[PDB]
Symmetry: C2
């Protein structure tokens, strides 16, 4: 790996610089190098890893949606034949997106998840596993689409089971997991009622636990609760 000669601490320092410079591909490469040093990641380091790849894949997803929309309009009755270029370029972006997802899933499998014993780390990584399988599902169309969907579901479900046993209902990781699993239900699994039920129950159980929190924790939790509420407003 091109980061193999750089100190772990230097990779983390440069990931933070890359974030400040909005250089998310660099940020992700630095964090991949840091993971590949083989040591577990601190909470701060896990968040750097997630921010970097979420930004990279987010740009790819947005581009893929633009191109997929153009491609779909091209196959509508009365559209002129423009040749293979739209499909080819959509496929190019798709393959790059899949490659990033495979890279993240590879880091999680080798060996972040298996060494993660604390609830906060294990839930974080299993949520990430669900997210990156979800991104693969968004572009899947062939035989394996059902298996990709089931992989996302299984990762999210294991994360949910741990989070419900080991974390309070206001914990921001637990809340973000529930948010993303509800989006999985709505957008991927064709289960809008499950999505709505999960978002509602998560919101209500968090609301009931806010009284236990400091001002700063209250701010953190209510921010994510508002995202649950925003989705409920859109979906109902």
């Amino acid at each position: 790996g091109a980061m193999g000669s750089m100190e772990r601490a230097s990779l983390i320092q440069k990931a933070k610089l890359a974030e400040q410079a909005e250089r998310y591909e660099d940020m992700a490469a630095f964090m991949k190098g840091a993971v590949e040093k083989g040591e577990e990641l601190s909470c701060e380091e896990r968040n750097l890893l997630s921010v970097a790849y979420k930004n990279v894949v987010g740009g790819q997803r947005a581009a893929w949606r633009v191109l997929s929309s153009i491609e779909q309009k091209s196959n509508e009755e009365g559209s002129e034949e423009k040749g293979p270029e739209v499909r080819e370029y959509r496929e190019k972006v798709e393959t790059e997106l899949q490659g990033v997802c495979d890279t993240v899933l590879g880091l999680l499998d080798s060996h972040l998840i298996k060494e993660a014993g604390d609830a906060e780390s294990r839930v974080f990584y299993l949520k990430m596993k669900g997210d990156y399988y979800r991104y693969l599902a968004e572009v899947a169309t062939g035989d394996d689409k059902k298996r990709i969907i089931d992989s996302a579901r299984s990762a999210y479900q294991e994360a949910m089971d741990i989070s419900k046993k080991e974390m309070p209902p206001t914990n921001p990781i637990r809340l973000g997991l529930a948010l993303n699993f509800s989006v999985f239900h709505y957008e991927i699994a064709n289960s809008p009622e499950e999505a709505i039920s999960l978002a509602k129950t998560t919101f209500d159980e968090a609301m009931a636990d806010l009284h236990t929190l400091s001002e700063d924790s209250y701010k953190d939790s209510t921010l994510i609760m508002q995202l649950l509420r925003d989705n409920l407003t859109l979906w109902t």
Copy 2:
């Protein structure tokens, strides 16, 4: 070149798709491939080339400025020694920026400028040559900084000489050239009075020619005139 097997028309089509998807690195690679087919570029194609590279280098410049600011704060009295990482990463971004500038300058030299005979194409490419030498000057610190600055100045000056002979004072290419040369004077050449004089004269001569224009051309010209006015307001 990786684009050598793709049809010219397909490269242009994909450049337009990449623009819609905000995939500017892809856009630039497609347009580089199109240039390397060896045919002259139409007005639309020249603008695709410029948009692509301006976006790529613009992101690099913004990142370089963030990192350079952090590096300068690190060398201020009482700042802790953080090691070589800030300098290293600033240098990495700088080298990538220089590489993009060298790529654009290489396309202009081989062989866009020498085949450009019409004023609109020749001025466009010489303005680009000035711009990319200007971006190199922004990061230059060694022996060649004076020579880089003079290369930018010479390209802009040749473009100005042609534009004044061959184009009306409201022509948007002429206006954008004057805008950028005035920025060169202010930011690069330590000549704020020259910058102000150029922006003022350009604005006033365009104003006097607006009466000759259609509604659509008037909109195009006045948009750039407002940019000249914005700089004058900042500089005076």
